[PDB]
Amino acid sequence: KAYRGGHLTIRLALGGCTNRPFYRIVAAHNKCPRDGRFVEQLGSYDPLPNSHGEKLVALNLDRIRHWIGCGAHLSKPMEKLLGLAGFFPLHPMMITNAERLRRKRAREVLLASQK
Amino acid sequence: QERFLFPEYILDPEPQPTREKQLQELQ
Amino acid sequence: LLSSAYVDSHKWEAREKEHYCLADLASLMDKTFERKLPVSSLTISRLIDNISSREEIDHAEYYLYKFRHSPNCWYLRNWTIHTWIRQCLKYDAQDKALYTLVNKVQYGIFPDNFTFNLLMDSFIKKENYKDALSVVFEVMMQEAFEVPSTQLLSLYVLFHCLAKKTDFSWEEERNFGASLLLPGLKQKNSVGFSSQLYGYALLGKVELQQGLRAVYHNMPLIWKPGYLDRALQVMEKVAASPEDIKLCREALDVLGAVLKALTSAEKLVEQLDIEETEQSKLPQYLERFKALHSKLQALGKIESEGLLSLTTQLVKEKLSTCEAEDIATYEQNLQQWHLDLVQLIQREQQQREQAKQEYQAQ
Amino acid sequence: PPERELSRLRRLYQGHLQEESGPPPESMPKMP
Amino acid sequence: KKVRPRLIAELARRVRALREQLNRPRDSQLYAVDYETLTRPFSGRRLPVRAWADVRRESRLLQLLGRLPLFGLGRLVTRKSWLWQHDEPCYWRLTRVRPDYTAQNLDHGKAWGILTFKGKTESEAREIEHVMYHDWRLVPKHEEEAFTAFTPAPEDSLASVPYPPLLRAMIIAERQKNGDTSTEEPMLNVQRIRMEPWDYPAKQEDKGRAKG
Numbered sequence: 168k169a170y171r172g173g174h175l176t177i178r179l180a181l182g183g184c185t186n187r188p189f190y191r192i193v194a195a196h197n198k199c200p201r202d203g204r205f206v207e208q209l210g211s212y213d214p215l216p217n218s219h220g221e222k223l224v225a226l227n228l229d230r231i232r233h234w235i236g237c238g239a240h241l242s243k244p245m246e247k248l249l250g251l252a253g254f255f256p257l258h259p260m261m262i263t264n265a266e267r268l269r270r271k272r273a274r275e276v277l278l279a280s281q282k
Numbered sequence: 283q284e285r286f287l288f289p290e291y292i293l294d295p296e297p298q299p300t301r302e303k304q305l306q307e308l309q
Numbered sequence: 310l311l312s313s314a315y316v317d318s319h320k321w322e323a324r325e326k327e328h329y330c331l332a333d334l335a336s337l338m339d340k341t342f343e344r345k346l347p348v349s350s351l352t353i354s355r356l357i358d359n360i361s362s363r364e365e366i367d368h369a370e371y372y373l374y375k376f377r378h379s380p381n382c383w384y385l386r387n388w389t390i391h392t393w394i395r396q397c398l399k400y401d402a403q404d405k406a407l408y409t410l411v412n413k414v415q416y417g418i419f420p421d422n423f424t425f426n427l428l429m430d431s432f433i434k435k436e437n438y439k440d441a442l443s444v445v446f447e448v449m450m451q452e453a454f455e456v457p458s459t460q461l462l463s464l465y466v467l468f469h470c471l472a473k474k475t476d477f478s479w480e481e482e483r484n485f486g487a488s489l490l491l492p493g494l495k496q497k498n499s500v501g502f503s504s505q506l507y508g509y510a511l512l513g514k515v516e517l518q519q520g521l522r523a524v525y526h527n528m529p530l531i532w533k534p535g536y537l538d539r540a541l542q543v544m545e546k547v548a549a550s551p552e553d554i555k556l557c558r559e560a561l562d563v564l565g566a567v568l569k570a571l572t573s574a575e576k577l578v579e580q581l582d583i584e585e586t587e588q589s590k591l592p593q594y595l596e597r598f599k600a601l602h603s604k605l606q607a608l609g610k611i612e613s614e615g616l617l618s619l620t621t622q623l624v625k626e627k628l629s630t631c632e633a634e635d636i637a638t639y640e641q642n643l644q645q646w647h648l649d650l651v652q653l654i655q656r657e658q659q660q661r662e663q664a665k666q667e668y669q670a671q
Numbered sequence: 672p673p674e675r676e677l678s679r680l681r682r683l684y685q686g687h688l689q690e691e692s693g694p695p696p697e698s699m700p701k702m703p
Numbered sequence: 704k705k706v707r708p709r710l711i712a713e714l715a716r717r718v719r720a721l722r723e724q725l726n727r728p729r730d731s732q733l734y735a736v737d738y739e740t741l742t743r744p745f746s747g748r749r750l751p752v753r754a755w756a757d758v759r760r761e762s763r764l765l766q767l768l769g770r771l772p773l774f775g776l777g778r779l780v781t782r783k784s785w786l787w788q789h790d791e792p793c794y795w796r797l798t799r800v801r802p803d804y805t806a807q808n809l810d811h812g813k814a815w816g817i818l819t820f821k822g823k824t825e826s827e828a829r830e831i832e833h834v835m836y837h838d839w840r841l842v843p844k845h846e847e848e849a850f851t852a853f854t855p856a857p858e859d860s861l862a863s864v865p866y867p868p869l870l871r872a873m874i875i876a877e878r879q880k881n882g883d884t885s886t887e888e889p890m891l892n893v894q895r896i897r898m899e900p901w902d903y904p905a906k907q908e909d910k911g912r913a914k915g
Contacts, residue, residue, distance in 0.1 A: 228873075253869035266695040276700050284384060286349050286657060288664040289341040293671065301721070305714045380804050383774070414808055419772040450770065452844045494845060522760065527770075529843040531850070532786075577756060578685055583678045683787060 173198035175206060175239035177231065188214050192226065192245065194234045209234065212248065224248060310462065310624060311430040315632050320643045321395055324358075324388075325650070331359045331368065338372055348376050350384035351653045357392045366402045369393070370409055370416065377417040385417050388646035394424045398431055407440055410447050422456045423639045429462045438473065441466045449488035452529050458631040460492035461624055464504055468617045479519050486511035487528050499612060500623050502547055503557035507616075509540035510564040517571050517587050521579060534580065537587060537594050540564060544601045547610060555612035557619065561602055568595050723914065731806035733913050734835035746913070757783065757837050764831065764839040765802055766810035771841075774800040779842035779851065780816070782833075786840070788902060791821040792851050794842060798828040811835065818904055822853030832907035863890035 176197040183189035190212040195205035210225040217223060226249070235241070241249070249255040334356040341348045353376045360369045373393070376382060397406035406428060410418045420428070425448050432441040445463040454460050467489055477485075486508040493504030513536040516524045525532040547556050572591055580586060587594070605611050612619070681688055728745065735744050741758055742749045750758060761783050768774040778797055785793040795816030802812035814831040817824060842850055866874065866889055874889045 253867050256867055269695045269699055270692060272700045272702060273696055276702060284656070286351075286660050287346065288661060288667075289337070289344055289346050291664055291667050292344065292346075293667045294344075299721075301714065301718055305710060309710055378804055378807070378809070382804055382809070383800070383802070414769050451772070491845065527762070529841075529845075531843060531846050532840070577760070578682065581675075581678045581682055583674065679787070 170196060170198050175234065175237065176242060177209060177234060177239050177245050178242040179212065179244055180205065190214065192248075194230075194239050197240070207234070224252065226252060226254070228254065310433055310465070310628065311426060311458075312629065312632055315636055316427070316430065317636070318395060320640060321391065324392075324643075324647065326358045327355055329355065329359050331356065331361065331365050334359060335368060335372070338375070342375060347380040349657070350376075350381050350386055350389070351650075351657055354386050354389040354392070354650070354653075357389050357396065360393075360396045360400075363400045363402055366397060366400055366405055369396075370405060373409070373416050377415065382417055385419070386646070386649070387419075387421055387642070388650070390418060390420050391424050391646075393418075394420055394428060398427070403428070403431060403435070403437075407443060411443065413447070413451070419451065421642070422453055422459050423635060423642070425453060426456075426458050426462055426635070429459075429466065433466070438466065438469055442470045445488050446484045449484065449491055449529065452491070454491045454495050456631065456635065457496070457627065458635050460495045460501075461620075461628060461631070463488055463492050464496070464500065465617075465620045465624055467504075468620050472617050479515050479523070482511045483515050483524060483528060486515065487530055491529065498623070499553075499555040499557075500619055502543060502554060503560040503612070503616065503619075505543050506540055506556060506560045506564060509536050509543060510560070510567045513537040513540060513587075514567045514571065517591075534584075534587065537568075537590075541594070541597050541601060544598075544605065548601065548605055548608060552608065552610060555610050556605060557616050558611050558613040559616045561605070561611060565598060565602065568598050726915065728913070728915055729805045730803040730811035730835070734811055745915075754837070761837045762839060763810055763837055764814060764834045765800075765806075765812050766808070767839060767841045768797075768800055768802070768814070769809045774802060775841070776800055778844070779847055781840050781842055781850075782836075783838040783840055784902065789821055792853050793820050793822075794851070795819070795831060796828065819851070820903060821900070822855065830907040832904050832910060860894075862894055863892045866891050 173196050175194055177192065177194045178197075178201075179190040180193050180195075180202045181188060182191055182202065191208055192210040192212055193205040193208045195203070199205065207230060209227045209231050211223075212225075213223045215222075231254075243258075243260070246255060247258045247261055250257040250261055334352060337352065338348055338356070341352075353372065356372060357369055360366055377385075393409075394406055397403055409416045410420070410428075413419060425444070429441055429444050432438075432444060445466045448454065448459060448463060454463070467485060471485070488508075489504045490508035490512065493501045493506075493508055495501065496504070512524055512530065516534070516536055521532065521534055524530060524536070544556065544561075547554055568591070572595055602611075677691065732745050733743075736742075736750070736758060737744055738759060740749065741755050764780060765774075767780070771778065776797060776799065779794045780797050781792075781794040795814070795818060797814055797816040799815040800812065801814070802809045806812075812834070814834055815828050816831055817828040819825070865871065871889055878885065878889075
């Protein structure tokens, strides 16, 4: 199907059954459906901690580099995952959400203590 | 820079050229 | 005020007019606008030349509006504007000239300094100070204080209006302040500096009473706050300047009155919250004003001479010096305009040579 | 950031300002 | 196997193209505004909240140029947004103008100027953008030199930055595998990257236009 515009984007396809999310890191034409056709699958991601308490992430770094070079963009979740991986700098919103969480914790601690 | 055209001796277009008639001829 | 030699029209009248019946070009323009095609700047210039009466002036201003709202309004001609003004003077349509100048936006009236001075001199000859004030304000809005003749004329008109006018509305204060500050800055003499002080005082009153936006909105004034600070700076500059430069006692008195009145007596915020307001700085302003006024009187740099009297002195003294050079420049502009009209005819005929081919191609 | 920049943002977003927050804690509170 | 030609489809395409061409709306129509509802009458869309005060209080570029000779050609025009955002002088030289004569007050159209941003000028005059916006202002003929007086601040900046941890590790490992035991840190040059403020004017020449 001819697409008017659009561009490659490295993103996540939400597979897995209900209440059991699981993501396939794929490089697909941005206009294509979320779980639909995709140019190439670059890895996978399991949000639910496994028996070892690990959120497994597989990133085919070679192909990820190749596609970023070819000009694929990066969805915010993928940028955050790469930042956690250390392949990219920590996302500004990751840092700022950490700080917001810290302030929330400080506020809640103060409120609980000031009974 | 600058140029002018003359409201005398004009050559003019037409309103509603009606290309529908042209296709009615074509088909 | 200006010499009859200045008022001389001989050259412009001798301009190489092309004579037609005004109805001729009127019909031509009507046909062009009916076709929705662009009239020629040369055509409108020729119609302006063919103006010959008061009703013809009315027809000409109507066609001027129509042309201004046309693609070639980007090609208006200074000689055409000067011809319009001269014709209005000729047929006593000075009211229409003033109205069109005020509505320059709607019509494109952008006269040169020479024409501005011509209109102002005609108004003063008629004694029409009330409307010479409006012409001065229009000059201010156009930012055409580039010549001492216009600067002096505007200063004299404004000071006369101040002398004959006591009650003020904040918009009038804004206009007065701008129209004084501009030529005041232009004039590097005691009169110019006193005018700058007067205008700054008025503008500062407007700022503190209405709003800095109210001051700088659509005016040729800067938006940086601290007009009172600039006034005090002007006084300090005069004090540190050569003693020959003096500040008018009337200007100093009005500035003191403004400060005293301010001291005695939806929403948006334009000032950075860290920068204090003039409302808070008022007491320091008053203290600095008192100290500087005492210092200036001690230095003797204060001038108790009346503003209007001193302006009249300067007008009688330096005006003719300005008038001679102004007339020389006007003659240079006249011959330039003649050459430009020749060029317009050249282009028009050269294009008509091809315009002979519209149907020939067919 | 400089107080100048904080004031500039205050001006820019006047009427829709959140409580200016200082630097965050050096480390995550443990929530005793 | 031969297809049946789509004559009516071709006619529709061409007719729509011609209709759009011949009824191309005027600027004074597209960029009108209702200062009561702050809605553009032509399309009926309401302007965003953050532009309400600016639309009510400030003026447009051509709305100013209409009150100047040669449409103020050769003057310096600054934007209120620029003035508020940056302490440095930013403005256009306004080399050329082309208003929409059809407007009653000739307060719409196009302009071309030499951009000066943050006090750094450009090499050519190009088309303006956001002409139709309301955050424009005029530099008075006087005060022009003082306002535009810009002291070039020291521009020296980081030549390079560290790689992200994993990329650094990858590069180092590849080097060691190749035997390149040079222990010098791997750095990523950034001078090549010409960072520009987000509000920097964009190329109006490539911008689109509204349609009816």
